[PDB]
Amino acid sequence: SNVYVMALDFGNGFVKGKINDEKFVIPSRIGRKTNENNQLKGFVDNKLDVSEFIINGNNDEVLLFGNDLDKTTNTGKDTASTNDRYDIKSFKDLVECSIGLLAREVPEEVVNVVIATGMPSNEIGTDKQAKFEKLLNKSRLIEIDGIAKTINVKGVKIVAQPMGTLLDLNMENGKVFKAFTEGKYSVLDFGSGTTIIDTYQNMKRVEEESFVINKGTIDFYKRIASHVSTPRMIEKGLEFKDEFYKEQDSLIEEVMSNFEITVGNINSIDRIIVTGGGANIHFDSLSHYYSDVFEKADDSQFSNVRGYEKLGELLKNKVEQ
Fold it and tell me: Where is the Actin homologue MreB-like C-terminal domain (predicted)?
């Protein structure tokens, strides 16, 4: 058979996708092109990074998805992100356009695939997983910028999101590293609004040693912009040096202190993977805080997808058998 592996990560405010050597990261927003013509958007000739999607012959709804969405329409809206997003039109359409974008990267008309993705650890076994897998596991006709692709799904594999990250750094040639099978690892995710720690022991998540700090990069940059008496500004030009080190000094002390309280002796931990939009900002200081324990992957935004892709490859073999 001719089967491809689609890895998708429907996260916070961005959707990440990868197929073969092709990948994308686009805000979790969707639009629609309607005849209520604008003055410039969609009228001028600029070649924008946005595509048109027609699903199953429904010409009455031309969906708009891409990084330049708002440059071509005024219909752009954020997609549902609640725990019940699986039943909201917004998210369902986002899933179809994301699948469509990956399908467009395959030259042939008929695109057979397996889909590897993830979901919040807390819904990974509930009725949510059943509805998400139902959205994913089906055939569909998608026309991307006028090009029809017939998409057949031969299999779906869903894991807890932090697992994609762990797998990015603990798996090669279809096998997890020996150390990972009986080790203790934590995923330290510096998000925009929260900082999440997920701990795994012998490949299984330990809820008793996982936690969330309700402070993120937005809070960081805000707390800095204040002492300097506008975060958007600090974000642009990180190389206020004094303030930075002060805010970050406290952030790191708080995070590691919580680690020692909840996870344990930092020496019982085999690795702490630092991920999230804030990883690049704090990895350096963390590395000097404790030696030989923190690790970071390049392009942290794609870590989950690279991890899901490996599981997708294994699912692809199971199917080709």
Answer: 187-285
The helix (H) or strand (E) run that includes residue 262 is helix 241-262
Instruction: Output 53-57 pairs: Cβ under 8 A, ≥24 positions apart.
Output: 53/96, 53/97, 53/100, 53/142, 53/143, 53/144, 54/142, 54/143, 55/93, 55/96, 55/100, 55/140, 55/141, 55/142, 55/143, 56/140, 56/141, 56/142, 57/141
**Structure tokens that stand for 304 in this block:** 């989950």
Burial class (CB in 10 A: 0-12, 13-18, 19+), 290: middle
Residue that the structure tokens 């057949």 belong to? 152
Rg of the chain on CA atoms, in Å: 21
Alpha helices, DSSP H, located in 34-160? 69-72, 89-103, 127-136
- Could you count the other beta carbons within 10 Å of the beta carbon of residue 78? 12
CB 215 within 8 A of CB 190: no
**Residue type present at position 188:** L
Give me the domains of the chain, ranges plus CATH numbers.
Answer: 1-177+297-321 (3.30.420.40), 178-296 (3.30.420.40)
For 20-68, give the DSSP string.
TTEEEEEESEEEE--SS--SSTTTS----S-EEEEETT-TT--EEESTT
Q: What experimental approach yielded this model?
A: X-ray
Dihedral of alpha carbons 209, 210, 215, 216, sign: positive
